[PDB]
Structures are given as C-alpha cells and as structure tokens.
A paper describes a structure:
The first step of the route is the production of N-acetyl-L-glutamate (NAG), while the second is the phosphorylation of NAG by NAG kinase (NAGK). We report here structural and functional studies on the arginine-sensitive NAGK from Saccharomyces cerevisiae (yNAGK). The AAK domains occupy the center of the molecule flanked by two pairs of interacting DUF619 domains.
The full-length enzyme tetramers consist of the AAK domains occupying the central part of the molecule, as in the truncated enzyme structure, flanked at both ends along the Q axis by a pair of interacting DUF619 domains. The lines joining the centers of mass of mutually interacting DUF619 domains are oblique in relation to the flat AAK tetramer; thus DUF619 domain pairs protrude from the plane defined by the four AAK domains. The structures of the four tetramers found in the two crystals deviate from perfect D2 molecular symmetry, with three subunits in each tetramer exhibiting the open AAK domain conformation. The degree of AAK domain opening is even higher than in the arginine-containing subunit of the truncated enzyme, corresponding to a 20° rotation of the C-lobe. The pulling of the C-lobes by the paired DUF619 domains possibly contributes to this opening of the AAK domain, which is associated with rotations of up to 55° of the DUF619 domain around a hinge located at the AAK domain-DUF619 domain linker (351GYK). The DUF619 domain is a bilobar (N-moiety, residues 354–447; C-moiety, residues 448–502) open αβα sandwich nucleated by a 7-stranded antiparallel β-sheet, which has the characteristic architecture of the histone acetyltransferase fold (GNAT fold). The comparison of the GNAT domains from NgNAGS and yNAGK (with an r.m.s.d. of 2.52 Å for 111 residues) explains why yNAGK lacks NAGS activity. The AcCoA binding site in NgNAGS, found on the boundary of the N- and C-moieties, is blocked in yNAGK (compare Figures 8E and 8F). W431, sandwiched between N460 and T436, blocks the part of the site where the pyrophosphate moiety of the CoA molecule would be expected to bind, thus rendering impossible AcCoA binding. The pairing of the DUF619 domains on each side of the yNAGK tetramer involves hydrophobic interactions between the E′ and F′ helices as well as the continuity of the central β sheets by way of antiparallel bonding of strands 6′ from both domains. These interactions are maintained in the four pairs of DUF619 domains observed in the present crystal structure (with r.m.s.d.s from 0.85 to 1.45 Å), despite the important departures from the D2 symmetry observed in the yNAGK tetramers.
Numbering used by the authors:
A (entry chain C), B (entry chain D), C (entry chain A), D (entry chain B): 67 to 502
C-alpha cells in the first residue's frame, strides 16, 4: 500500500539515495539481491524488528536469502541439561548429545522466524536441510562439525521463484545423510560465493566496527586500498582480523560490484542502500595508481579514450592530442584507477597546484571512486585549487570538498588548504584574468 | 470462483453424496482432513492430475497432509549407476552409497510436486526433514533404515496454519542427526495415528488390491474377519503383506470407523468424500460369527432384543417367540457380528436358500457392516434369494447386490447366482404364491 | 473460501437441485443469470436478508441484475411534506413536487442497497439513470409518468464485466433528459426481454400465488400445458390473469431454459434453484405429442437430430438413416415433446411391446419430462419391456418404473405389467439369446 | 507492488520533493486529496496516460475526485448529424435535440474512463447523476443549461469510502428531474468549494501559461503578491484574465494550504506534488512585507517567537532581548511574510550589508518562501554578505545563491555582487578576525 511508500521515503535522505534505490529495483536481477546472515541472538530477542524489516524488502519486491544461526539459547539448554559446552580452536566440539540439542534449537528458531514473517504477510519457506553438502572438519577434533563442500541452489531458487523468502539454517549434511554443525558465517560466505549477490549483510548485535584507538566508528573500508596497512595495525583486535580477512577472501572471488556490510539490526534498511548508515561497509574498490609521466600509463591510448569523456574536450576547445603534448612537457602527478574510470591530473607548477583534469565516469561517481581520489589528493597535496562548471551535476560536492569558492561567469573556482589573504587574492585574480 | 463450485457439483451424483460432502466441510476440523500417501511413481509420471486435484482440495479450503515416496526413479538411477537394488523383508537395504542417491531423489521429487502445486496457485511448503524422529531398524540388516520413534507435529501444523499444503518426504532422522530411509507407507501410517484424520488415502498405481487369483479387485476388506486367511493366500505377494499388516496395525489403534482407502489418483476427489470411489477400502469392522443353532448364540436373550428391531416383528405379524420356535426346528446358517448390530439368517431348506431375516441397524448401515455381511453370504451361498419392502430406505442397494428382481404388491423379490430360466420361474411362483 | 461451499451445500436438498445449480454455473453466460425485481418495501425493512442473499449469488459467481422500486416510504414522506398522494387509473399522478420527493427516495434507497452489499464485500454499482429511455405516458393525466421506449444495455454490461452487481432504479428519462416515474414490474420485464436471462424473479411481499377456491398454493405452472384451462377458470382473480398473461407473453419470446419466480424474500435463495421452495414458479415446459408415422413429425430432420443423441447410434452400430428406414416400415407409437428434448419410440410388434428408443436429454431428465413420458406409456401400454445399460446414470429410475429385472453381461432387462410366469421366462430367454 | 515504488522514485528529483511527497501521505487527510477536472479531449485521445496516472494515485492510497467533460467528440457528432453547433456568450445553446446527443456522449465517455481504470485494477464508480442540483441559467438564452445551486456529497463520499474512484459527469439536474448541461470548469470549482481539497487540477491539452511578451512560461503565480500588478498588465490576454480571476476567486474561499494547477496531462503526477513540474501552478501564498523598525511589525511579540527558532539564540549566545535592543538602534531592512514563517534581517551599516538573521521555518523552506525572500534581497541589495553553519541542513542552497564562499572553523562566509578583489579580501579578513 502506502505503508510501504511511507517507509521507503522515511529512509531517503538525499538525491543520491533515490538514484541508489532505483538501481536495485530497475536492475533485471537474475543477479540476486542479498544474502543476510542473522545471528541466533536476534531471532530469540529482537525478532519483531528483523521481521518487520525483511517484510519491507519482500513488499518492495526484493527477495533476500536469509541464513540464521542459533547461538546463546543453545548454550543455556546444554547447561540446563548438565553439559558444560566445549570450544576448541573457536569452534564447538559437537558430539551426538550436543548435536541433538543444536538441531532442535535450529528448527525451533528457524520456524519461529518463518511463522513470524508469515504473520506479517510475507511468504516464508523454511529450508532446514539440503542446501549445504559437507564433510567432517576433523572428526577427532570437532566430532560432528562440517566443512562445506558445496551449495545446491535448487531449493533457494525454486523458493524465490515461487515467491517466498527462503530462510536457511546453517546445517550442512554429508552424502550419506549425517547432519553437521557449521559456522553461520562461513555458511553465509559460501552462499555469497555461489549466488554472487549485490549485498552481503552480516547482522551482528554489536554494530559495525569501532576503532579501539581513536574511538571513532568505521563507515567504509576500501580493501584494495586500506586492507594491508589497516590489518597490520596494533589497535585492530584479533577477532576483527579473523573477520576482516574472512571478508577480504570472500570479495576477492566475487565481482567488484559486490559489497559487504556489518550492521546492527535497527539500522538495516538504511545501509542496504546507503553508505551513510552507521555500521561498517566493506568492499574491494579501486587501487588508484599514481603516475608522473604519459609513457608510464600502460594504456598509451585508453588515457585518451578516458579524457574524451570530459565536456570541455568533447565540446572542442582543445583536443586531447593538443592537451597530451602540453602534459608530457609538464611535471604533473596523475592518480587514476586501473580501468581509467576516473583520472585526476594535478599540474604541480603553480603554487596552489591546479587539478587540471578530473575526468570521472558516471559509474565512478555512484561508486564514490571520486570521493577516494580526493582523499588521496588531500594528503598528497595539502593545498590545492580547481575549476568546475557552474552547473556541473555535482557541484554541491565540490563545494563540500573546498574551503573557498569564487564564481566568474560560467566557471567556479575552488580551493583548499590556503589562507594567506594575499595568496587567495592571487588565486582569484589569475582566475578572473583567465578570461582570454 | 465458480471454477471450484462446478467441479464439486460435477462430482455429486445422488443425495447421499451431498450429505457426505457436508459432513467433511461442516466438521470444525481441528481434527485434520486427510493424510494422502503418494507413491513416487505418481510424481514422476502422473503429476498434473495429482496437482490439479490437490489444488481443488486447497481451493475448497481443505488442507490435505501429503506424504510422498520415491520408488522407481531411484531404482533406475541405482541401476544406471550399476547397483542391483536390495530388498530384505520388504525394506531396502540402504548403505551410505544408496542413501545419498535416495536422499537426492527425495528432494528432487519433493520439490517437483511443490513447484507443481505452486504453479497451479497452491501454496506448498516442502518439509524435507524434521517431522519424523527415528532410530535404526536393525543396523546390521537394513543399515540406515529407521523405525519411527515419534512424529513432531509442529511444522505440519504451523504450515497448514500459515496456509500452505505440507508436502512431506518420508525421511526420519535420529537424535544425533543421521537421516534414515523409512517406507512411505509406514511413515503414512505413523502420521495417521498422530493426526487422527477424517480420511486416509493410499494412492497406488494399479487402483486398489487386485486379486491375483480371481483377477479383479477386493472392494472392502474387513480386517477383523478376513485378515488372516486373506493374507495367507498363495496369490498375495510380500510387498502387499508389508502394506496389509502395516494397515491392520494402524487401524487396530484407531477407532472402529477410521478407515483406509486404496485408490488410483484419477479418482481421488471422489473418494475423499463419497464411497462411490470403488477400490480397496480397508477397515477393522466386525468379526461376523457363523452360527447353526439357537443355543449356540452366547446371548439367549439379546438375539431376541436384536430381531425386535425388524419392522415386521415390531409391527406384530409374528412375535419373536413364535419365530424362534420355527428357527430352532430348521437348518439355518446365521451370521451375526459380536454385538448383534447386524443379524442375517439364511434358511437353507429351499434350493435357492432364503435370507429370511437381515436385521441391520441404522448404525450398521452407515458403517457398511451390511456390505460385509453380504460379502460373507456371497462366498458361503453362491446362489441366494431374499425379499425387501418396496420402499426400504436402501432398496437401491439390494438391487445392486442382485442379478434379478420381481415385484408383487408391496414386496420385492431378489436373487443372485441363478439362471436356469425354469428355476427362476420356480422362485417367482413360490414368491407370488406366498400371498396367504 | 469454504464459507461459500458450505452455504451452497446447505441449500441443496436433492439430486435434481444439484443438476439445476450446475446449469446456471456451467452456463457460459453471455446469456445472463437473472433479472431480480425488488419492491421498495424490502430495502427499507428487510434489507439484511436481501443483501445476505445477493451476496451469496455474487460469491458463488452469479451476477444478478437488481432492479428496485420505492413504494411505502415515498407515501409517508409525501404525507410528512403535506401532499395527499394521488392515484388516477391505478397510477400515481406525479407532478414536479411529487417527482422531487420520489427521486430523492429512489437515490437514497438505491445507494442504501449498494452500501449494504458493499459492506458484505460485494461490489455494487449504483445505476441511477440512463438504462431506461422513455416518453410521457400521458402528460395531462399522469404528468411526469413515463412509458419505456427502450433499454440501453451498455452500463449494465460494463458493470457485470468489471465485476459488480448492477443496482438499477426504475426511473426512465426522456431524450431531452426529464426523468419520469415508471412501473418497477414493467421495467423488470423490459430488461428481461433484452438480456434474455435464465431466471426472472419478482420479489413480492405477498409470497407467490394461492388458489382462491381450494386454498392450496401453486408451486409451478407449466404454461404450454396448463395456461389455457388455468386461465379460463372461474376462481382465478383478474389481477392474477393480468399477471399470468403478462408472464406467458414474456417467456413466449425467451428461451425454454428461462423461468419466472414469484417469491417472498425470505424463501429466495432456495427457489432460485429448486422448485420445492414455496412461492410460485412459472415456465413454458412441455406437451408430449403422440405420433404414429415418421412423416407425422413436423420436423422431418430434427427427429434425426434427436435420435443422434442416443449412445448406440452415436457410437455407430446403426446409423440413423438405416434406423429410420426400419421405423417407417413398422407400427410404432412415439411420444415426444414439442422441441424433441425427449423421444420415446415403442415398437408394438412383439407381445410385450419394446421401448426401442428412449432418447432423453440431460435437460429433459432434470425437468422430469422423462417421468411424464413414462406415465403416458403406462396407460397407453399396460405391459411393456425395455433394456438399459448396467451403469446408465439413472438406472435406479428404471428399476423404480419396473415390476421385474434381469441382468445379463452389461445390459439390464426391465418390464412391467406382466406376470404369466411363462411369458416372463419368454422375455428372459429372448433377451439372454439377444447376445447375437 | 514495486510498480508503484518505481513510479514514485522516477518522479522524485531532489530532497525537497521527498519531503513534499511525505507531507501528502503523512497528512491524516479527512481533508481530501484532489479534484481533477478532465477535458473531454483527453478521454477520447490520450486515455492510457490519464488512467495510468489516476491508477497511481489510487494505488498509493489517494482518492482523486475526477470530473470530466465531453467537448470535441460532441461537436463532431452534431456535425455528422448535420447540426451546426451553437455558442452564445461562450456557452452551448442546448435544446432537447442537442441535449440528447450531449448526454449520450457524456455517458459513453464516462463509462470509457471507468472501464479503462477498471482494467488497470482500479475500482471506479460512474456517477452520471445526482451530485449536482441546479436550475436553468436562462431558459430563453441557453435552453437546458443549468446554474449549479448545490453539490450533494453523499455519493462521492460513499464511493471513496467503499474504495472506488468517483468519476463524475458534469450534468446537474433540477428538483423536478430535468438534466441540464453545465460547464465542466464551473462544476469542478463547485466541487472544490465543497470538499476543500488540497490540490485542484485543471487538465488542459494546451499546457499551462506562456508569457506572450517575454516568451517565458509561468511556473507559479503567488496571487496575494502578484495578482494585482500581473492582472493590470498589457501582455496578459483576456482569455488568461478571465481564468486568472476565476482561480483567484476560487482560492479566496479555500484554505491557504489549497492550490490550483493547470497542466498538460503528461506532466500530471509530477506537479501533483512538486512545483518544478512544467505547467502553471497558482495559489494565494505569502506577501513579504518590508519593515524598517521593530515597532513596525504588527506582532510586537511573535517577532520574538520567530527569532527564537534560530539555533544561535536557542543555544544561548545572545538572547533575543539583547539582540532586539541592538536592532532597534540600527538601520536595518527586514523582509518577512505575513505569518512570520520566514524573517530576514539585513544590517545595512557595513558596505557589503550583512544578512544578520535569516530565520526560516521548516515549512517556509518546503514552501520556498526562503527562495522568494532572497529574490527580494537580490534587487533591493545588489551586493550582500552572510554567514551559515558548515552543516546547516541546506548549505547547498546558500552556496547556490552566492558568488563567493570562505570557510573558517565551523562557519561559512557567503557573498554576492562584489568583485573588487581587494574588497573581497576585506570581507574574508573581517570574517576570519571575527573569531573572538
């Protein structure tokens, strides 16, 4: 009804978000929406919120594949029953007695989420077995704990197809039928490899990643860029490292378009579409490559193909040829990602270096490659100037990345990092005098 | 719509059927509608008809619990793979290698029925595990074949409740998780014990229990009476015994009414309501006790109490006293159930023996004790005559059980087994001359 | 849901009714279901029952065209407003002041039924104008009272089509737009001529037709048969005659399938389908015509079209041509109704005349034309024989019409009126030897 | 489904629009949605678009009252039939013969829109009569053309209530029943007066209002502000004046919240919610009032109540008291609308006058009172400076209204109209030095 329209609008903040939401809906998504790993903690305690939110996705069309675990509840019942639980190497030692109680919990939890969604008018389908094939992790060490050998898709598909949210337990079974306990996170990840979904979401109770050393939360992690010198940091806790790595390894084998998000339940249906949602959002993103020379770029040609995108060389003031000659005879730094989706060229020659070209693709903008290119520029050029058309689609954005702005006919001058009142005036003159 | 109303009316023949259909609908059925056991043969071959028909029940409201097996398809894939299948004691010897192929078949079949029903707009819910708990039948003999220890209802209920036909595979699993093969018929029977449903239907491919000796089906089987010598027959196969016994054992534990019907898929939605639906109908019913002498009946008195029911001794032409004298001085066979709900007395003295009294209770009629009493009479008296009031409630029925009929004022003469035109004429004369 | 199925079955008494209901549903009804004229009395007073009942039809699919008046309520409001009503020649003198109060009543009533049905989940569509075109009855005499010149169907259709019970007021309007008061019964009839519906139902408060001379109510009138000598009766009141004729004239030009019913509201959703409902039900129905010669039947051809129905000439043993040659060369009597829906041919040539063909339509059976044909046969042939298939739909019926029966493989021999033990035996032999 | 979500997002451009849309939905709208007058031209020609668009509103919950005319089609059929149409005083002379052909058109068109909407799954309800009561405009002059005396709401309500878009023809009728032709626009306006709806939309084929003298289209007209000196303009054509006045007069008697819009059909479901839709949008709106003195404001007090909204006086640096003292002792110009929803105060005292306070309500922003206040400021202060928080919700907007910007910690300095490089530097210093 409008019940859905309200809740969508209530979760839209800016224009960029509207465009995002449409991308997912206007996507002819034989490429699946999302795999959402749900902790057991959440079903037992915070269910209404989870259901309400899955109901929304269902209603707006999208079909998340939900995969849930069964954590705390199990340990109480094992204690109730007089069995002190076991963890060797961070995994549960899982003998017959324990497995009985683990499975009964799984089914109880699984059906509780399904009957809940069903009560909010969503079609659910419990899938308590036969998605995951596996074999023993180490029969001596973990007893009945499995290593997932393969995912059969057919039930998860012919659910979605029939119009019903598939709710999966994270039990795998062997050929011969013996069920085995498997980490809900490793199972999540195996699904993700197999459906290559647009979003992968790990719902924790906790809520993303806090930086133990600054206190500041982490919004986004750009693995290709940040992974290595964020992993080898003293503040990052080892439970974090064993997940950050886990995720890097997943997204290594999934497309670039694919992302992962770690979120508290309550902030979900925001950061399933935004990156301003609190909670942490991780993806590969692009290694920018710093270059000081035309004959550095592996692409002699495709550098031209990229700069042609610009609406000052495509509307011919200067051709690229005439511009590349000028470049090669000038000390410049150029950041560009591997596939030349975003090139930035900074002419270093005038105090307040100019960002002379910043040719960024429509795809580069919605992927905030641009955001990242400017963050490089920041630390590499503590003071900087550039020009934008008065009606560049995202002028707002340039304003935001600046400290000062001037507008002569048509063009806006921007800069940052500078505040000699008299060196400012020098900028503004050279710019206004630039009308030749 | 009407689509459903047409197909209901198209399957209503007489008044008695209308009354029947109402009984099932007007039943405030927290006592469940039906358990329908579907052979694997039917899903692989005759699916459309099965789905179309379950779709009907679903549309008219009713929610059958459907439990399917997975026969031939498995045996082909076992043969494809080079394994000659094994049956000891009518159950499959089932090792790891066999179980893997049995379970993959079950899921494949289960989902195929579900995605089929779903395409005809019926909500199905695959329930591939966790209805049945079991333990090993005999681990040495059958390997991974289970004995069903208990049925958990909660999934089958909270399916129906959420509005979707529950389609069960007949796999059980042990505490510790190992799945085990169980006969689709033994599993069907365990469900029936626990939901006590109004109808139990075993769908077979042939269309009942065809008699290997005589050639044609066995319509009603009275277990208490017929079981033992209708099992130890030379024509009867061993897969039949593991059904016949399985059913005897079920109905031993269910009320005198609860019945089983064995029916071809093609005429399912006739049985589910009427008992037109010819095919083998099996139930406990009564041990009829054959007697040749008044002073045989343990009840000297209650024989009188029974014959008083008759509306030719209750409207006093002859009292019972005056009739019991006549009986005792005549060679007669009398079949009567233990509680004298139906007495039949056959005077043996005239070629074409007379069925002289057939005193059957209102309760005996709706319980087809009558049907059964006549089936005894059949084999014991290959030729027989009797008299019915022109307006006996169920005259229709007597016509049906006859080969020939004559009507003098008030009374209708019936017989069977005889066709000497001249011995027929002798019947009709002795009857018309019976007007004294 | 079943809610509808229960209420349908709860209103089915006998077999004949089941067949009737089917007729209406299985009708692919570009030929409409019903025109139901509702008195104003009923909307103001007995509404719940009228809505509950229309709802039923709506739910079981059927779309009655409802046309309502506005009687008693008007006369109170005219009196409330100080206008003493006028009747000249049994019609309301209807000036501007009266018309204003009549129209306001009509709309109020019309919407009250619509909003009522709508509250029971039925889609209604008020149609307050533009169905009936008319011109002044007599402008000097009745002022604004109209004579219906024509019905425009388009609204009533594109309502039903879009799924909504059309509720019509009985106002007509002139070309130029002036609304005029018009008889709700003459309007009902004009609709009927134009939609050719299956049921035409006049809901009166009264409740059918009583016989002033016996006191006995009239269930059914068979116009073709009874009209003439029921019209020229001294007991029949003139207000009755002016209606009986009215109806005869309507149904003369509507199909044979069509009927009229005059019922008290409370007995409605019984005698919209049964003929055992109290209230009077009228229709054309059938005189049987006795014929002794092929070239007697006015239809040379349609006799063939009739005999083709038979499942021994349609499954081609003998074609009709070859059978008609045989008939024409044999003394036979043939009873057949006017429209050849039931033919019976009796070959007179063998002692115990045979009923050689008895070709009776599905419509003829539910009409009990058959019953009547056999009653003619009775007095005209005091002894008679015939043969029926062991599984003829209505074998029960033949048994009933017989005195004696024999069954050889497949076919049953029947007769009546004979009791020379030795002429009986002759029947049974000729029949058993008929296996030729 | 999503079908609705897509079409909503496809019509949202900026943040401001999101907020607008939420206003209409989150409105507990016992205050109705809209009256949409549709020209006859659109049904006959451009129907799909009209239905597709009314369907949207229906789907997102909103129930427009549609009132349609019947223009060109009528004039063709009158010409087909050989009658040259009549217009005296811009209205149709409408005698009996014409009325017949007018009414038939109306019903034909009306039902065509209803059966169209119905095909897109919207419930429509034709309302061909009984909404409008009227009497003759001038019986001699126009014959059967009416003047609408009153609107009865009951049908239109009990439609919406029963869940169906009411589609009204613009025929009125007299007490006594004579239907009369009435201008679709006068009728639309009469509905508007009676339901006081949020939006009144006149769909023309043409598409809004062009300025004959500049060529520029007119987006919005702010009647209270512009009416008088836009009416007494030489370029405004008289057909425009007769409409502008028409509308002024309507909105005079409707709330301030109510608006009128004149749009081409294709741009409809945009400027039913936005004001950036092409087409013209008219409403009463807000006169800004220029003030030079505290004791000018009619509100001694509510000026204080307004300035308290500001988050530099609400977070207490300076109270309003202490600020109002300063104001009164300073030459300042202050623009504010009548209800003080948006105040701007410009301290004139420093070359580059400061906009010292600009206190604008959330409602003032979504109304673009702010936009208009700055436009006044523009012509009155050709050069101007002001300060905004770095994270003021709508900082983007300030940027846009500027020529130059500087950012010291926290605060952004803005200005326009000035380009002495050295007077700019003077601004930036006085600002950076403003850190006390």
């Amino acid at each position: 009804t409008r019940s859905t329209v309200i809740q969508l609008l209530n979760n839209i903040s800016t224009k960029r978000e509207v465009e995002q939401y449409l991308k997912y809906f206007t996507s002819v998504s034989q490429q699946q929406f999302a795999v959402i790993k749900v902790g057991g903690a959440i079903i037992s305690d915070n269910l209404h919120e989870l259901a309400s939110c899955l109901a929304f996705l269902y209603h707006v069309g999208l079909y998340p594949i939900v995969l849930h675990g069964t954590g705390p509840q199990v340990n109480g019942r094992l204690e109730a029953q007089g069995i002190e639980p076991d963890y060797i190497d961070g995994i549960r030692i899982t003998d017959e007695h324990t497995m009985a109680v683990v499975r009964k919990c799984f089914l109880e939890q699984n059906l509780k989420l399904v009957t809940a969604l069903e009560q909010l008018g969503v079609r659910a389908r419990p899938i308590t077995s036969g998605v995951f094939t596996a074999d023993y992790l180490d029969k001596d060490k973990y007893k009945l704990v499995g290593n997932i050998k393969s995912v059969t898709k057919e039930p998860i598909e012919a659910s979605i197809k029939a119009g019903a949210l598939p709710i999966l337990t994270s039990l795998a079974e062997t050929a011969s039928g013996q069920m085995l306990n498997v980490n809900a996170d490793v199972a999540a990840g195996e699904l993700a490899r197999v459906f290559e979904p647009l979003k992968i979401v790990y719902l924790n109770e906790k809520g993303g990643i806090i930086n133990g050393s600054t206190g500041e939360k982490i919004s986004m992690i750009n693995l290709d860029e940040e992974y290595d010198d964020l992993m080898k940091q003293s503040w990052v806790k080892y439970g974090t490292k064993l997940k950050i790595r886990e995720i890097k390894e997943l997204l290594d084998y999934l497309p670039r378009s694919s992302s992962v998000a770690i979120i508290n339940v309550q902030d979900l249906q925001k950061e399933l579409f935004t990156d301003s949602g609190a909670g942490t959002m991780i993806r590969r993103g692009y290694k920018l490559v710093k270059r000081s020379s035309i004959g550095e770029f592996p692409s002699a040609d495709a550098l031209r193909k990229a700069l042609q995108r610009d609406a000052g060389i495509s509307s011919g003031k200067e051709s690229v040829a005439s511009y590349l000659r000028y470049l090669e005879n000038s000390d410049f730094v150029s950041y560009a990602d591997e596939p030349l989706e975003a090139v930035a060229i900074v002419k270093k020659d005038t105090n307040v270096p100019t960002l002379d070209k910043f040719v960024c693709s429509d795809a580069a903008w919605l992927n905030n490659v641009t955001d990242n290119v400017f963050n490089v520029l920041r630390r590499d050029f503590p003071a900087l100037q550039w020009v934008v058309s008065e009606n560049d689609a995202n002028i707002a954005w340039h304003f935001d990345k600046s400290q000062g702005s001037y507008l002569k006919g048509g063009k806006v001058l921007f800069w940052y990092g500078i505040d000699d009142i008299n060196t400012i005036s020098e900028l503004v003159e050279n710019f206004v005098k630039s009308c030749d």
